[PDB]
Symmetry: D2
Subunit: 470 residues, 4 copies
């Protein structure tokens, strides 16, 4: 018995039809439907499209059957002629049985169920459903026929397209996978956004500039890179190698608090700043007066008190300097179209006082269609360690700001200056590049928290994060 | 008599062979050679490759003739058999005569001359040479055969690839055109970097988010865009619409001087800041004390005196605040691998004093292979007006910094936040988008100027700038 | 002002619609329509489809616009939005004006007019109509809308497909050209049946077996070749080199008469048998008793008197042997489904008496769908001389038999045994192969002749035969 | 451990190299090598080419590695750098182990071993060799390196191309399979000549003309069909359905003997003529005087005594009429280039006396390059029953005539007039069309028989005939 994937277009209210018609015209979705049902890995094989009599008859009489595919119509007249391109069958169960048998065992690369309302209510959440390819349409236009909600206990988002507007309607394409993933069409498999990271790492190792510094540490490097992650359906925590999510969460709440005390993190078991806060390190960069843990005026201070005179990590800076985080929140709520929604840790006057100069040195925010997007500029990007952490960090910040400002998250755009791989990390990164991505996890923030200073680690729920091993 | 294009690989010293061999192995260049000679617009037609007996014999006896193309060998034995795929001819002049005649008049889409040394010394700078496709190899390895330098009086760069390293050698692909340009292969035509701008404008007008502000001005906008321009062979001054080059030059020398006085520009006939410096404008944003022309602590001041206390445009700020431009020049010369080569106009403490907040808000520099690259972050990008000006501005800055630091320019990377087209500019921009790019101009800086403060407008030579009309 | 081609489907009665619907469903014709309008020589360029508002609205609202092509709708509301893919225009004349202008001057490879009834009545027989691509449907099902008959004074058939049956309807695809022909789509250009001959000649010269005989005459030869010619819309008299049509007609009427006297042809100025009938020739093959001109029991005798005892060319053989031609005519009229409709000149008993053994040695006839087809076996085929003559000869015989038996001609199938080119003819044949075919002529037989023995040369009308020069 | 296929070019003497060079230049074979190693079913996957260091170094330094494929070089220096496209391995066994492991488990569609002499002597006849793709070169030019003969006990021919001449050398491409066959490249799988039959049956059932006769028996029919079978490496006895080989052999020896007595076959247990020889049948067609079994002057009589006066099946016709079979044998031996090597059962004078008119009504023979070819004209072709039998019959006749005339068999060309499927056979034929062909068998004739009249059934050896079940 063969397995199948569902292809369906649906309103917010999960509606699929008006009066035996579609209450929308979307040529981009028709093309997607064509592309995903027609095209094959093997140019010799073809796909099966399984549909109800109602769906078969809905198709204009000229364009029947759906060209290029074996059209399986399910029928119950006890009235439709079988051909090379058309087969009748009594049930979904029987169609699946037939396609597991010669000649279709070899002839048919994949099987798509495409409706109508009756067949989808059965098909959608059966375990032999490998994947659902949903066109999500942002409308509430009246529908008479509905399908169930996707069962998110057993389906997880693989990919979700950048939303598009056609004929007055906003929509996107979201693939869910039942939880290999190699059953996906190649075109959908390749849409996993983790490949934007993996292809960049490959490109830097293959084609980076070779370089060196005063300690004899070596690097392969590229200059001026961009990666864009969709936050709408899933959260880009890398799956090819475990990311330190707990440290992402704790470090960001620490930044938001305005703290420059590494001991606040050390006390919680987060050691990522320990190397830049030690007696030995501070001595070694000429800060012999500075207290262990006092990083100086780094991110937290610049974000909450830009321009204030720094003294020590213990001073009360209340009402001193410019509170960029409060300013950003104010613009997002009260002037969403503003082109200066900016928060920056880059303060040339203060660099001499900092245990380390800011690397994620500025972010801009944008609002459209009720969604909050973020673009962050990273001057120095270690692909192996820092880049996956920073993707998760600014994606989280985007989600928190959207949440507190009564919006939904849009996209995170990651801009890199000097993007490098250490010569020593080339071997382990090439092992990591043999791993195939798993679906990203889904991240939910506690609805009872509405104020940027009021979060704790337990407010962030990650579901379905199972990355490849150490 | 048909026209032709040259395809050749050459060292810095313009060398093409060692001892009847190539002193390099570059599979990427062999593939380029294959791609440009083999592929056609029409899948029915084919190309002619014209070569000398020496070149014909150089080809291993197994891979003759060059498959997929009509191979025209020029011969002078008073010893080589004509076929469907091989034609002998007495001269370049005779080969060209033959291909202008049936059946080759229809059968042959384009004609490529590919050597050897004798035929290229004739072919390279004949007026029936439409274009030269040069593989430029960064080596000085001994050669016995040489071709002339490209005659830059009659050839201009169309496109030049991002340099690549293969088998220890650095190289790139540069197409020169004789000065339509529709004779170029489609693949080379499409490499003109002006299409990066034109495709972005189209994409924003087609798919931008619709928006509005408190005066009833309307926009189509996208968030998080990147364009990368090659500065190595030509200068990206847009050709589909004239760019105000003189104002680019004067404004940048003004920024470098540290001046915040718009009258310095007004006095030279540059009015681009007049709107933001007028009694009326300054009044209207609550700067009623501020003198006409006093923009406040804008780019020039932030670049030369970041962090200093601003008073008026007349004050001597010598030794006050942080001189970012001097710091950048110092790092480029003395620590080229530094990951903090940064100059920023973004100073939240000073925004209240500025006639307009900085829009081009930060640039980072990078050095590798003797080349200086720049990445600039623009928070607000009017595609119609500001973006072409700013491309020219930061490309010029990159060139000036390379010049003063004894380097050559690499790439300019343009990063956009809110990238928008005014609803009112959609009609004129769609007229502009019907224009086909002309080759970019070539920009030379006076060698006798070696200090960043010592330039004047006459130090910048632009050759071959002929943009489409108003 | 650009030129165009018409694409239309039409009944026998030249009907195109029933009640704003099509009275047929033909997926093969929809695919043809798609293929000819969509596909381009240049994979970068596209085609324009020009249509009336009525045609635009007829298209289901989902599949608008026609994907892959610039859709030009002609409108007269004094109500339809222009896009990248949709342009409104006031007239055919205005649409053509617009597509001759940038950007469409380069952007648009070819222009197709596809209806509806109003636009076609104007477009069909305008001189800027290069070609008509008609789907001819063999039905009389009621139509309410009609187009004019094709004006055969100015349009000539280029190609006509082997008829196909789909959904109970018989139809074919016929291209007419206005009388280069290089304006045709490549796919339609290549359908000219003269290429079946030209590709065979090329294949024998390129890949034939080299051979020799007892006089030192040399040949390139292949064994077991087939060519199929459509007689339904045009008559396969080769255009790349003039065929001796008058001798075809006279020789065949001579065969039909039963004559074996070469002087009957000599007396009319037809000398093709003179070489095989001369005192010298007959002596040289040991027929020293035989009269000049007496060929012996060759085609005419075998066809009308198979098995009779031959004496001389002057004897009255009335009622002697088997009259194969009368037998064939009887089966075609009275038993059309017979699998033995055969006429053969192959009589081993008689070979010793023949001036030359039969070369076109047997033909079989077939009847289906009111059409008479013929398959002829030629044991020895000179590609340069005999094969074009014999194609015309048996195509004529097929037409005459169809005419006398109240049928229409179907196909002529030419089967070759030893298919050869003389080494001496390779040079002239390679000159001939540079000629592009012109449309075949159209051949009409006098309706007042109804009996196989009653024809004369003036009964055969050839229109539009203009072959390439000597 | 993955499986592999060998790709190699070899002389008659099984030689592969001269002095580390190839003693031939064959661009057609280089293209075949490229096509079979490069192309994949899946456009995403690629192939592995496994080769010896000697083979790796033999490749000109410019065209390394073989583009488009994973190049696995086997090495034993205790000197060659691994890349994305190049992997070193210690053995064939180790290379196969590595390609069965990630990422190559998914990345690599098929594995080809391509030499040199050392690796092939191991690889050629190992059980993990699925197939051998041999270019067979008709030359005896000196070679220094040889591979073993193909072990015909375990390898059987799948397909063998029509021989081609390039650069003075005759050669062909022969695939052997180890005895699914779905491991073959799609291009080689589709070359099985049994598909020429299967595609014709499909084409007649899908597109034949519907017809009927005076008993209410129905047919689908096409007119003018050709199939060409290669006899050089295997014998075309259909595998999708068992062919009655014993009756083929007995009927043909019966034809050759000149017998018209069906009892000669009945007495041996061959009943195929019983239906046309019965008291009842002969009565029913008005031959009430004729003896049971006396078929009249049918094939055997026409072949050995064309033109003689028939009396009964018992008469001694010695020296009466024309002995076509002796004439054919004489021309094949003594005038092989003759264009009249013909044997015909078509005698219009005798049709009234025949129990059934001849259906296989004429054959012509051709000699070139030491090979005997045959073209046979069948006026009436039942695709289901008669056509497979007749293919085997005339292929056998071709083999017997080649054998007795000291030649090798070339091609059998099957020409059909009325080619039909009975409406009643459509269902069983559509079952048969689900069967995938098995390799044809190999047929050997007893060398001690040299005279056409001296054969018996035991002189014909068929090896490897295992057709699909009833």
């Amino acid at each position: 018995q063969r397995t199948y994937q569902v292809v369906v277009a649906a309103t917010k209210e999960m509606g699929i039809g008006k009066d035996g018609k579609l209450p929308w015209n979307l040529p981009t979705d028709l093309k997607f439907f064509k592309d995903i049902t027609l095209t094959t890995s093997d140019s010799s094989k073809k796909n099966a499209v399984v549909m109800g009599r109602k769906t078969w008859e809905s198709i204009p009489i000229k364009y029947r059957p759906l060209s290029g595919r074996l059209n399986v119509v399910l029928t119950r007249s006890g009235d439709i002629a079988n051909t090379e391109n058309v087969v009748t069958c009594s049930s979904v169960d029987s169609a699946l049985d037939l396609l597991a048998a010669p000649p279709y065992c070899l002839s048919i690369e994949r099987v798509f169920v495409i409706g109508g309302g009756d067949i989808l209510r059965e098909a959608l959440n059966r375990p032999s459903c490998d994947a659902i390819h949903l066109t999500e349409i942002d409308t509430s236009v009246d529908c008479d026929t509905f399908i169930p909600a996707i069962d998110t206990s057993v389906y997880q988002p693989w990919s979700s397209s950048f939303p598009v507007t056609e004929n007055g309607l906003r929509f996107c394409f979201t693939t869910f996978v039942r939880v290999k993933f190699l059953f996906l069409p190649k075109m959908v498999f390749d849409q996993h956004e983790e490949f934007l990271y993996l292809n960049m790492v490959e490109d830097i190792i293959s084609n980076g500039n070779v370089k060196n510094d005063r300690t004899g540490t070596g690097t392969l490097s590229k200059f001026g890179c961009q990666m864009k992650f969709n936050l709408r359906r899933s959260f880009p925590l890398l799956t090819t190698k475990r990311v330190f999510w707990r440290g992402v969460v704790e470090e960001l709440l620490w930044f938001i608090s305005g703290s420059t005390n590494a001991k606040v993190l050390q006390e919680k078991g987060i050691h990522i700043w320990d190397g830049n806060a030690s007696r030995e390190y501070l001595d070694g960069i000429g800060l012999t007066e500075r207290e262990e843990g006092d990083l100086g005026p780094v991110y937290g201070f610049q974000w909450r008190h830009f321009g204030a005179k720094y003294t020590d990590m213990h001073a009360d800076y209340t009402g001193q300097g410019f509170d960029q985080l409060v300013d950003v929140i104010d613009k997002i709520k009260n002037n969403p179209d503003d082109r200066r929604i900016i928060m920056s840790a880059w303060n040339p006057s203060d660099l001499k006082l900092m245990a380390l100069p800011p690397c994620h040195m500025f972010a801009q925010f944008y609002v459209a269609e009720g969604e909050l997007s973020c673009q962050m500029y990273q001057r120095s990007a270690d692909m192996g360690l820092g880049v996956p952490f920073n993707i998760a960090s600014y994606s989280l910040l985007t989600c928190m700001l959207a949440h507190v400002c009564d919006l939904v998250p849009g996209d995170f755009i990651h801009v890199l200056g000097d993007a490098h791989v250490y010569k020593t990390h080339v071997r382990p990164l090439q092992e990591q590049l043999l791993n195939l991505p798993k679906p990203f996890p889904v991240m939910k923030i506690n609805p009872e928290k509405k104020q940027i200073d009021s979060f704790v680690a337990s407010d962030f729920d990650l579901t379905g994060y199972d990355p490849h091993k150490k």
